[PDB]
Amino acid sequence: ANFLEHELSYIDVLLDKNADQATKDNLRSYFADKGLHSIKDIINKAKQDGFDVSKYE
Amino acid sequence: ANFLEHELSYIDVLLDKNADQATKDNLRSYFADKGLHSIKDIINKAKQDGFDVSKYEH
Amino acid sequence: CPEQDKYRTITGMCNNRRSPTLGASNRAFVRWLPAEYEDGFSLPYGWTPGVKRNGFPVALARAVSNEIVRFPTDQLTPDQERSLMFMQWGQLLDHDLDFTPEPAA
Amino acid sequence: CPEQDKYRTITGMCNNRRSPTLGASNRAFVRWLPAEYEDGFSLPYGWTPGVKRNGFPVALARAVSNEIVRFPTDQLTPDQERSLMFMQWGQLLDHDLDFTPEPAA
Amino acid sequence: NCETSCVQQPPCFPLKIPPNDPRIKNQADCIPFFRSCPACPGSNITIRNQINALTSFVDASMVYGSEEPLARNLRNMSNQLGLLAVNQRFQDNGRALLPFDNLHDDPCLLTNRSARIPCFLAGDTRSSEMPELTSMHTLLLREHNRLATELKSLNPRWDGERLYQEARKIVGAMVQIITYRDYLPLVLGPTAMRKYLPTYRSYNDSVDPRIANVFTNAFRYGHTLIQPFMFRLDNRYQPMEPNPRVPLSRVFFASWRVVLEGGIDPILRGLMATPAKLNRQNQIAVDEIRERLFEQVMRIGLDLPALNMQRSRDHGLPGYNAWRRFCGLPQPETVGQLGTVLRNLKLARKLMEQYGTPNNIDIWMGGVSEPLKRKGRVGPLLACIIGTQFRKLRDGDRFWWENEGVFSMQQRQALAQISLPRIICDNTGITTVSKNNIFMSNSYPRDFVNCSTLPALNLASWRE
Amino acid sequence: NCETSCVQQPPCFPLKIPPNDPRIKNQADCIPFFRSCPACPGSNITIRNQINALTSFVDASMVYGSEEPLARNLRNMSNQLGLLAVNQRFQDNGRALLPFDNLHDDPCLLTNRSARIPCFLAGDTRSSEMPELTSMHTLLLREHNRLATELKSLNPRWDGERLYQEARKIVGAMVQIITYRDYLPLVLGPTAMRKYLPTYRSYNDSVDPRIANVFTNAFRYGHTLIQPFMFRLDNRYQPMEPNPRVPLSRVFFASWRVVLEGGIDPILRGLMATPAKLNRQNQIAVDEIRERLFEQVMRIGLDLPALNMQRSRDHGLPGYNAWRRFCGLPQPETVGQLGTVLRNLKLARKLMEQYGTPNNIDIWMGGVSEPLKRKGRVGPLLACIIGTQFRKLRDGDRFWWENEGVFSMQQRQALAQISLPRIICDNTGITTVSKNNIFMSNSYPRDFVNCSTLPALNLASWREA
Ligand SMILES: *[C@@H]1O[C@H](CO[C@@H]2O[C@@H](C)[C@@H](O)[C@@H](O)[C@@H]2O)[C@@H](O[C@@H]2O[C@H](CO)[C@@H](O[C@@H]3O[C@H](CO[C@H]4O[C@H](CO)[C@@H](O)[C@H](O)[C@@H]4O)[C@@H](O)[C@H](O)[C@@H]3O)[C@H](O)[C@H]2NC(C)=O)[C@H](O)[C@H]1NC(C)=O
Ligand SMILES: *[C@@H]1O[C@H](CO[C@@H]2O[C@@H](C)[C@@H](O)[C@@H](O)[C@@H]2O)[C@@H](O[C@@H]2O[C@H](CO)[C@@H](O[C@@H]3O[C@H](CO[C@H]4O[C@H](CO)[C@@H](O)[C@H](O)[C@@H]4O)[C@@H](O)[C@H](O)[C@@H]3O)[C@H](O)[C@H]2NC(C)=O)[C@H](O)[C@H]1NC(C)=O
Ligand code: HEM
Ligand code: HEM
Ligand SMILES: *[C@@H]1O[C@H](CO)[C@@H](O)[C@H](O)[C@H]1NC(C)=O
Ligand SMILES: *[C@@H]1O[C@H](CO)[C@@H](O)[C@H](O)[C@H]1NC(C)=O
Ligand SMILES: *[C@@H]1O[C@H](CO)[C@@H](O)[C@H](O)[C@H]1NC(C)=O
Ligand SMILES: *[C@@H]1O[C@H](CO)[C@@H](O)[C@H](O)[C@H]1NC(C)=O
Ligand SMILES: N#C[Se-]
Ligand SMILES: N#C[Se-]
Ligand SMILES: N#C[Se-]
Ligand SMILES: N#C[Se-]
Ligand SMILES: N#C[Se-]
Ligand SMILES: N#C[Se-]
Ligand SMILES: N#C[Se-]
Ligand SMILES: N#C[Se-]
Ligand SMILES: N#C[Se-]
Ligand SMILES: N#C[Se-]
Ligand SMILES: N#C[Se-]
Ligand SMILES: N#C[Se-]
Ligand SMILES: N#C[Se-]
Ligand SMILES: N#C[Se-]
Ligand SMILES: N#C[Se-]
Ligand SMILES: N#C[Se-]
Ligand SMILES: N#C[Se-]
Ligand SMILES: N#C[Se-]
Ligand SMILES: N#C[Se-]
Ligand SMILES: N#C[Se-]
Ligand SMILES: N#C[Se-]
Ligand SMILES: N#C[Se-]
Ligand SMILES: N#C[Se-]
Ligand SMILES: N#C[Se-]
Ligand SMILES: N#C[Se-]
Ligand SMILES: N#C[Se-]
Ligand SMILES: N#C[Se-]
Ligand SMILES: N#C[Se-]
Ligand SMILES: N#C[Se-]
Ligand SMILES: N#C[Se-]
Ligand SMILES: N#C[Se-]
Ligand SMILES: N#C[Se-]
Ligand SMILES: [Ca+2]
Ligand SMILES: [Ca+2]
């Protein structure tokens, strides 16, 4: 289950306005295989598993 | 265990007044291994599993 | 296992002292090869409609029996050198070796 | 298992097409001999106080370590013809081959 | 419920019906089949495997039972004579019948309903399946009691436990001797017998004596030997009137025929003086087992060959070529190669039509298709499997009759005189029996001798 | 339960403490032990057996993982470059470290508390157990990314999936080559290598490639090779001050040392330029594993040799003589016969004092006691078991690198150039590496060459039109 620290960098890509739309959908698909279906689900999972997520507003 | 037809003959031995004392102990012990601890347990098991035990009733 | 004994146990337990279930009753068969199931581990070939075995359709057991095994029983060939007791000892012997349980009703 | 493929699966599934779990992860080890347990099927030798193995007491593994394995570590013999990388490749390779899970507390 | 439903839901694996079936025109029907019990039920992780409910050893557990409660129930516990229990309602011209079992759904009762004769109780649950089998069960019961009686006379101090065990040990040895001296050479033939069963050295505790899963299917080669009738013969080896030739589909579970149509003697004579069916490639197995198996006691007639093939799939058995390779035999890839292997391109074409490759041929079907070794009744594949199994059962049996310490050298000299004809003489009303090897001898009067010509078992070395 | 309790209750099988133990004075204490998970839990019918959580094949599953979810978590999914994921907070003089794992109970955190460096994430869960191990994991991570990078440049149309698989297949082949060409001959020695690993013919689908239960214990022969220190060396192969020789009891789970005490290069140089411990009959295993195993992260120091022997009992393994017989080797009954077999009557006397018969000698103890085959580091018993295992892994592997159809004949000619020294040159700041066979070469400068002298892997035959 546990959110992994390197997966925090994926949250950045998904929020990068200039990140490619295909690139985001491949990450969205990756997180959907783990039961995380929005960016809000991803950020909340990272919070619960112990990561500082305060930089996401 | 279902009660077996040949085990009816053991009920006869246990009731034979002139049957050997050790012989009855052998059979008492055999039925005790099954969880049949009286002759009432033996004859009621024989009833439920299909055989007539009224032919023994004293 | 007793270190000395005189007779076989009923279950077959302790015949082999180093591995005492070996040949004893209510144990798994040994496998001489790896098992071949539709799913790798459980489902028999012919369970799932359309699933092939090693690139080939699974043949209905009854079809195989119909086309291969069936013969006109008027053609029956008696064995000059074997009694019917020869088949019967096989079945009696089989019943000393293996019974495979199934579920009931 | 797909009829044609190009890469290994991650799990090892389908490497062997006739028996597709063989060498795949999360499966039982194969045994080259019958297993030897105190009770025939489950309990290890040394489990029950006083139960012998093949007519002899079971030795505390720590006692065997104490009496046979221990040595003054400062007298260690270096291997002239092997690097320490030779041990390290063994452990890395072992980690390609087997991990035996145990229950979590 | 697998017996009535054609739905494929655990634990049911019913046999589907092909188009243009010669019996079952309705493709929505099926032949019933329950999958064998898994060793580890419910498991994701394990590779499914089946259970042997019996002792693998050749120990006459079909007489004595393979579990301790059944073993007690089979014994006569009313005295210290060390006897097996006998039928309390019926005898066979004065001699013991097997006791009756108490099954909640008794198939034997369904054969002749007016007769009300249930299935017999024995060491193995299948004792009633054909009366010829029942007769052999009965013979061994009698032999035990006869031996127990004779040993009691020889050793008056011996208690019931000692008598039972000593008799049991003898019966065990007799089954082993008959099997390995007389029976198996006629299955395997001389070459394979020498190859798989070389002369006994000694007990080897590293020989695994378990039954292999494949042997449960391979040893059903014997289904090819089965004749479509039960034959009964009078004391002159003539037909026993009025019903000398009963169709097999009318003897399955027909325990009443042992009890009421004149006991075991007519059946044993029939077994001795009738040939087995020959397995031929165009005549593999008879319609009494292929079309009408157990049709008296079930909604539909089963197909025993089809069951065998379904059962090998249930057990996850590899196909023919994998077993050929296991046995060190050529593995044919093409129809032409399979033709060479079978000496029969026509049969090869039929097998390839059904299976598509010789890799997929079910072990029974492939096994029984092969031509027979010289003087054997199996081909090389089945000879390997069967021979390998029986070697393990001998060499991995700590109580094998020849193993140092099981019997004295005198008891062994005595046991070497046993034979199945002798056992029949000693426990039936038959006074003329097969000569030679009983399993070859099949023709009255040519192959027959008077009982008095045969050497008895001398129990003098059991004195104490 | 089993970590802190000395009560013997399922699934715990603690090792009891003998009287007059040299370390554990308290006889009421114990060495912790959890029995390995049964394949069929709770069963009265089945004979208990253990599980392998990994692919038996030599497929670099310690890099890629043995389960699909782990395998995707180890990948860099932010682009189509086909890369493995790398640490996002730390580098090693510009190079990738392994990503950090997220464990509920992280042992690595307990080694240096101020440092707060958790265990690494890898294909296998044990990657942090020694930093030397970690270094090898890190090396192979880098080599994957290097190959994926080079193939991207060679085949720009290839997507992330294709790049990852092609790199993965190459890494797999490199592990197989180093294993069978370089490593195993120095384990088995030439006689046993010829006997158990004759020249590859072709893939055989009737060879069972499973790991045998016994191999899990037999292959722990390598515990006899372990040296009581981690050695770190600078770029002149001199001791890296301040701590060039760390006791092993201070490196177990010490992931911080890779991150904060100067990366993988000093550890790899140490591996290359230090000898292994020789296994001798009177010097079987060192006190850092026998007395202090994992003592930094646990209530008590474990005994790895004792664990091995307890583990063989847990797994129901037959004793020494049954395995000798299996292998077709004489079975000694008497102390004198065991003296002949061990070429060592004194060791034979010790073994018989403990076990009473050679039938009961635990397989590891018996295995590692045997004198070594000429030019090998195991005796005949272990060579049979290990040799048989690795033959099955080669011949029963459909994707073995030599098998027809796995690589082109050109890719095979290219892969035959690979070596572990070359891999080190390509993925570290090291410019001088072991010559020869890396596994024998152990002395700087005698056994060392410049990286420039070594042939690189030419990927030109992976070009796709
Ligand atoms: C493909 O590989 C298989 C398997 O090979 C084995 O493993 C590989 C890794 C190599 O090490 C080989 O040396 C091994 O043999 C080969 O098939 C095997 O062929 C041999 C020889 O034909 C078979 O052995 C025969 O076995 C007969 C049956 O008894 C065996 O099994 C019982 C029960 O387990 C046992 O008690 C007995 O002792 C035997 O082991 C036996 O009658 C006969 O004399 C002979 O020993 C072996 O069984 C085969 N195994 C399998 C799994 O099929 C192929 O030949 C090989 N083909 C190639 C390379 O083309
Ligand atoms: C007591 O009986 C055992 C078992 O014998 C087998 O079964 C009986 C019924 C007969 O058929 C025998 O012919 C059978 O061998 C004997 O032990 C076996 O001895 C042989 C010969 O030394 C051993 O074979 C060796 O095995 C080595 C290891 O690899 C084998 O296993 C792998 C793993 O499955 C397999 O891949 C490979 O093909 C081998 O089969 C091998 O290096 C070597 O070349 C040779 O094949 C065999 O392993 C032993 N089995 C056991 C269970 O220990 C005893 O010799 C016998 N003793 C006496 C006095 O009779
Ligand atoms: C009168 C003779 C015989 C039968 C009637 C009969 C029937 C069966 C049946 C129904 C099975 C089970 C089928 C299934 O897979 O559900 C079966 C299995 C076995 N056979 Fe049969 N058989 C008769 C005769 C013989 C002879 C002569 C044999 C051998 C020489 C023989 C063998 C076997 C064996 C070993 C089995 C499997 C037993 C198991 O349960 O493990 N049979 N037979
Ligand atoms: C470099 C240091 C090594 C260790 C630290 C270490 C430790 C262990 C431990 C703790 C186990 C489990 C013990 C138990 O039974 O509870 C263990 C098992 C295995 N080893 Fe170890 N090992 C180190 C190093 C090596 C080397 C150099 C080996 C081989 C060349 C080696 C082998 C193995 C194997 C195969 C296992 C079993 C793996 C499994 O779970 O299946 N080890 N080791
Ligand atoms: C037990 O043996 C005695 C003596 O042979 C006999 O009278 C009795 O019928 C037997 N009983 C059973 C159940 O076999
Ligand atoms: C059925 O059993 C009775 C015995 O009570 C017998 O007379 C009759 O002939 C049997 N019927 C058949 C079909 O043979
Ligand atoms: C993925 O690759 C890019 C480009 O190399 C890198 O900057 C990024 O950190 C990587 N993400 C990982 C390894 O999680
Ligand atoms: C622990 O780590 C700190 C910070 O990384 C380092 O300065 C220190 O020397 C290390 N040693 C200890 C306290 O074990
Ligand atoms: N009659 C009887 Se059991
Ligand atoms: N016997 C078998 Se798979
Ligand atoms: N595959 C198997 Se057991
Ligand atoms: N491998 C074994 Se038991
Ligand atoms: N004994 C066993 Se698997
Ligand atoms: N230290 C010692 Se032996
Ligand atoms: N039991 C079943 Se599918
Ligand atoms: N024999 C039988 Se079901
Ligand atoms: N001795 C006896 Se049962
Ligand atoms: N072999 C014999 Se009986
Ligand atoms: N006809 C006859 Se048996
Ligand atoms: N069946 C035939 Se040819
Ligand atoms: N011809 C042949 Se396999
Ligand atoms: N070879 C043959 Se059947
Ligand atoms: N057609 C046929 Se088999
Ligand atoms: N074979 C003959 Se006749
Ligand atoms: N069997 C014969 Se001829
Ligand atoms: N699990 C146990 Se003991
Ligand atoms: N030090 C000691 Se033993
Ligand atoms: N696990 C099993 Se059989
Ligand atoms: N930082 C990290 Se994974
Ligand atoms: N070394 C340390 Se904390
Ligand atoms: N290596 C380990 Se736990
Ligand atoms: N990945 C691929 Se084809
Ligand atoms: N060269 C090699 Se494996
Ligand atoms: N081959 C060798 Se060392
Ligand atoms: N740590 C040290 Se020296
Ligand atoms: N344990 C420590 Se620093
Ligand atoms: N083991 C521990 Se705390
Ligand atoms: N065995 C011996 Se020396
Ligand atoms: N003991 C010894 Se070397
Ligand atoms: N070398 C590297 Se990232
Ligand atoms: Ca038996
Ligand atoms: Ca692997």
Q: How far is CA F74 from CA D71, E30, F122, in A?
A: 42, 50, 7
| DSSP secondary structure string for all residues of C67-102 | III---GGG--EEEEEEHHHHHHHHHHHHHH-----
Return d(Cα D42, Cα F315) in angstroms, integer. Answer: 9
Cα-only R_g, chain D: 21
Q: Residues with Cβ < 8 Å from E139, sequence gap 6 or more?
A: E264, E268, E423, E424, E427, E428
Counting every residue written for chain E, the total comes to: 464
Set of chain E residues whose Cβ sits within 8 Å of the Cβ of F204: none
Output b/e per residue, F52-88; b: 16+ Cβ within 10 A: bbbbbbbbbbbbbbbbeebbebbbbbbebbbbbbbbb
Which atom of ligand 40 is least distant from the CA of F145? 3
**CATH code of the domain occupying E1-464:** 1.10.640.10
**Residue of F128, F351, F401 whose CA lies nearest to F251:** F128
Q: What is the CA radius of gyration of chain E?
A: 23
Test the E interface: residue of D19, D31, D42, D100 with most E CBs within 10 Å: D19
What are the residue ranges spanned by the domains of chain A?
Answer: 1-57
Q: Is F315 annotated as a binding residue?
A: no
- The answer, yes or no, to whether any atom of ligand 19 lies below 6 A from the CB of E231, is yes
Three-class DSSP labels, chain E: CCCCCCCCCCCECCECCCCCCCCCCCCCCCECCECCCCCCCCCCCCCCCCEECCCCCCCCHHHHCCCHHHHHHCECCCCCCCCECCCCCCEECCEECCCECCCCCCCHHHCCCCCCCCCECCCCCCCCCCHHHHHHHHHHHHHHHHHHHHHHHHCCCCCHHHHHHHHHHHHHHHHHHHHHHHHHHHHHCHHHHHHHCCCCCCCCCCCCCCCEHHHHHHHHHHHHHCCCEEECECCCCCECCCCCEEEHHHCCCCHHHHHHCCCCHHHHHHHHHCEEECCECCECCCHHHHCCECHHHCCCCECHHHHHHHHHHHCCCCCHHHHHHHCCCCCCCCHHHHHHHHCCHHHHHHHHHHHCCCCCCCHHHHHHHCCCCCCCCCCHHHHHHHHHHHHHHHHCCCCCCCCECCECHHHHHHHCCCCHHHHHHHHCCCCEEECCCCCCCCCCCCCEEEHHHCCCCCCHHHCC
At F64, is the secondary structure helix, strand, or coil? helix
End-to-end Cα distance, chain A: 24
What is the C-alpha to C-alpha distance for residues E6 and F37, in angstroms, rounded to an integer? 39
Q: How far are the Cα atoms of A12, A23, A34, E217 from residue A19, in angstroms, in the given order?
A: 9, 7, 22, 63
- Choose the closest CB to C18 out of D20, D21, D54: D54
**Residues with Cβ within 8 Å of residue F71, at least 6 apart in sequence:** D10, F64, F65, F123
E strand or H helix that includes residue D92? helix D85-97
**CA–CA distance, E252 with E130 (Å, rounded to integer):** 5
For chains C and D, having 3+ Cβ pairs within 8 Å is answered yes
Give the whole-angstrom CA distance, residue F358 versus residue F341. 11
Q: Which residues line ligand 37 (CB under 6 A)?
A: F 3-4, 32, 298-299
**Chain B residues near residue E103 by CB distance under 8 angstroms:** 2
Q: A2: which 2 tokens?
A: 């546990």
Q: Is the dihedral of CA E246, E248, E249, E255 positive or negative?
A: positive
Q: Find the closest chain E residue to B34 by CA distance.
A: E69
Q: What Å resolution does this PDB entry report?
A: 2.1
- Please work out whether the CB of residue B9 comes within 6 Å of at least one atom of ligand 5: yes
How crowded is the C-beta side of F8, counted as CA atoms within 13 Å?
A: 13
Determine the Cα–Cα distance for residues F63 and F85; give it in Å rounded to an integer: 11
Kindly report the nearest CA distance between residue D34 and chain C, in angstroms.
7
CB C83 within 8 A of CB E439: yes
- Partner-chain contact E206 F46, CB within 8 Å: no
Degrees, nearest 5: CA angle E59-E60-E66: 85
- CB within 8 Å of F11: residues ≥ 6 apart: D102, D103, F2, F34, F35
Residue range F1-465 forms a domain whose CATH class is mainly alpha
What is the rounded CA–CA span in Å between residue E171 and residue E181? 15
The alpha carbon of residue B53 is apart from the nearest alpha carbon of chain E, in Å, by 15
- Dist. CA C76–CA C74, nearest whole Å: 6
For F54, phi and psi rounded to 5 degrees? -120, 165
- For the CA of F99, the closest atom of ligand 29 is 3
- Report yes or no: C50 at the E interface, CB cutoff 8 Å: no
Q: Among candidates E122, C12, E157, E75, which has minimal Cα distance to B29?
A: E75
Pairwise CB contact (< 8 Å): C28 & F318: no
Nearest to E172 by CA among E14, E63, E331, E281: E63
Q: What is the DSSP string of C17-69?
A: SSSTTTT-SSEEPB-SS----TTSSSPPTTSSTT--BTTBPPPPHHHHIIIII
What is Dmax (Cα atoms) for chain F? 73
Q: What are phi and psi of F350, to 5 degrees?
A: -65, -45
Q: Among all residues of chain C, which has the CA nearest to that of D27?
A: C41
**Cβ(F183)–Cβ(F360) under 8 Å?**
no
Does residue C56 carry a catalytic annotation?
no
Is residue F55 part of an annotated ligand binding site?
Answer: yes
Residues 6+ apart with CB under 8 A from B1: B34, E69, E73
Say how far apart CA F404 and CA F130 lie, in whole Å. 38
Three-class DSSP category at F204: coil
Nearest atom (ligand 2) to Cα of E204? 1
Of C25, C92, C96, the CB nearest to E67: C25
Structure token pair of residue C74: 């008027």
Q: Which of F360, D94, F384, E369 is nearest to C18 (CA)?
A: F360
CB distance A5 to F73 below 8 Å: no
Residue E455's identity, in one-letter code, is: P
Q: Which residues of chain C neighbour F47 with C-beta distances below 8 Å?
A: 21, 27-28
F205 in D contact zone (CB under 8 Å): yes
Q: Nearest 5°: phi and psi at E368?
A: -80, -15
User: CB count, 10 Å around CB of F9?
Assistant: 10
Distance CA E262, CA E245 (A): 14
For the CA atoms of chain F, what is the radius of gyration? Answer: 23
Closest residue of chain E to B33, computed from CA coordinates: E69
Which structure tokens are listed for E292?
């009408």
Q: Are E314 and E35 in contact (CB under 8 A)?
A: yes
DSSP conformation letters of A3-16 = --GGGHHHHHHHH-
Catalytically annotated residues of D: 95
Cβ–Cβ below 8 Å for F323 and D33: yes
Which of these is catalytic: C18, C31, C82, C95? Answer: C95
Peptide-bond breaks in chain A following residues (C–N over 2.5 A): none
Helix (H, G, I), strand (E, B) or coil at D53: strand
- Cis, peptide link before residue F11, omega less than 30° from 0: yes
- Ligand 18 proximity of E415 Cβ (cutoff 6 Å): no
Nearest to D19 among C16, C17, C36 (CB): C36
H/E stretch holding F15: strand F15-16
Cβ contact F77–A9 (<8 Å): no
Contacts of C25 in chain F (CB under 8 A): none
User: Strand F15-16 vs strand F30-31: parallel, antiparallel, or unpaired?
Assistant: antiparallel
In degrees rounded to 5, what are phi and psi of residue E401?
-65, -30
Nearest CA to ligand 11 atom 1: C34
D17 touches E: beta carbon within 8 Å: no
Half-sphere CA count of F191, side-chain side, radius 13 A: 11
CA E441 to chain centre: 19
Q: CA-to-CA distance for F6 and D105, rounded, in angstroms? A: 14
Is the CB of residue F79 less than 8 Å from the CB of residue A23?
yes
Cis, bond preceding F242 (omega within 30 deg of 0): yes
What is d(CA F248, CA B17) in angstroms, rounded to the nearest whole number? 84
Nearest residue CA, atom 1 of ligand 39?
F347
Structure tokens at B51: 């055989």
Chains D, E in contact: 3+ Cβ pairs under 8 A?
yes
Q: How far is the CA of F62 from the centre of ligand 40 (A)?
A: 19
Give dist(CA F422, CA F430) in Å, integer: 10
Q: Given CB atoms, is D34 within the 8 Å cutoff of chain E?
A: yes
Cα distance from C50 to chain E (closest Cα, Å)?
A: 14
Contact B50 E102 (CB under 8 A): yes
D54 at interface of C, judged by CB pairs closer than 8 A: yes
Ligand 17 close to Cβ of residue E161 (< 6 A): yes
Closest by CA to C39, choosing from F428, E48, B19, is E48
In which element (H, E) is residue F136 found?
Answer: helix F131-154
B46, closest residue in chain E (CA to CA): E102
User: Given phi > 0 = left and psi -120 to 50 = alpha, else beta, which region is E253?
Assistant: left
Cα(D60)–Cα(D49) distance, rounded to whole angstroms? 11
Nearest to D40 among C3, C19, C36 (CB): C19
Residue F423 token pair: 């891999």
The set of long-range contacts for F299-302, using a CB threshold of 8 Å and a minimum separation of 24, is F299/F3, F299/F4, F299/F32, F300/F24, F300/F29, F300/F31, F300/F32, F301/F23, F301/F249, F302/F31, F302/F32
- Can you read off the two tokens belonging to residue F350? 């010790």
Name the method of structure determination: X-ray
F206 touches E at CB < 8 Å: yes
From atom 4 of ligand 1, which residue's Cα is the shortest distance away? F207
- Residues E206, F40: C-beta atoms closer than 8 Å: no
Sequence-separated (6 or more) residues with CB below 8 Å from residue E127 = C95, E62, E98, E119, E120, E121, E133, E134, E137
Per-residue HEC secondary structure of E217-234 comes to HHHHHHHHHCCCEEECEC
Q: Cα of C80 to ligand 25 centre, how many Å?
A: 9
Closest of F52, F70, F68, F53 to residue F122, by C-alpha: F70
Cα separation, E21 vs F195, whole angstroms: 56
Q: E233-266 as b/e, with b when 16 or more CB fall inside 10 Å?
A: beeebeebeeebebebbbbbbbbbbbbebebbbb
The amino acid that residue E113 corresponds to is R
- Is F322 at the interface with chain C, CB within 8 A? yes
If residue F365 lies in a helix (H) or strand (E), which one and from where to where? helix F363-369
What residue has token string 């892997």? F457
Query: How far does chain F reach from its first CA to its final CA, in angstroms?
Result: 61
Kindly state whether D2 is in contact with chain F, defined as any CB-CB distance less than 8 angstroms: no
- CB contact under 8 Å between E45 and D21, yes or no, is no
What are residue F340's phi and psi, to 5 degrees?
Answer: -60, -45
Closest E-chain CA to D24: E45
Tell me how far apart the alpha carbons of residues F209 and E416 are, in angstroms, rounded to a whole number: 47
DSSP string, F429-443: S--EEE-SSTTT--S
Write the DSSP string, B4-56.
Answer: -GGGHHHHHHHH-TTS-HHHHHHHHHHHHHTT--SHHHHHHHHHHTT---GGG
* Interchain proximity F45–C28, CB inside 8 Å: yes
**Is the C-beta atom of F337 inside 6 A of ligand 38?**
yes
Contact call for E88 and B30, based on CB within 8 A: no
Query: CA triplet F12, F18, F19: central angle to 5 degrees?
Result: 145
- Exposed e or buried b for every residue in E126-165, given b needs 16+ CB within 10 A? bbbbbbbbbbbbbbbbbbbbbbbebbbeebeebebebbbb
Q: Is any Cβ of chain C less than 8 angstroms from the Cβ of D2?
A: no
State the closest ligand 34 atom to the C-alpha of F188, by its place in the atom list counted from 1: 3
Cβ pair A30:F77 closer than 8 A? yes
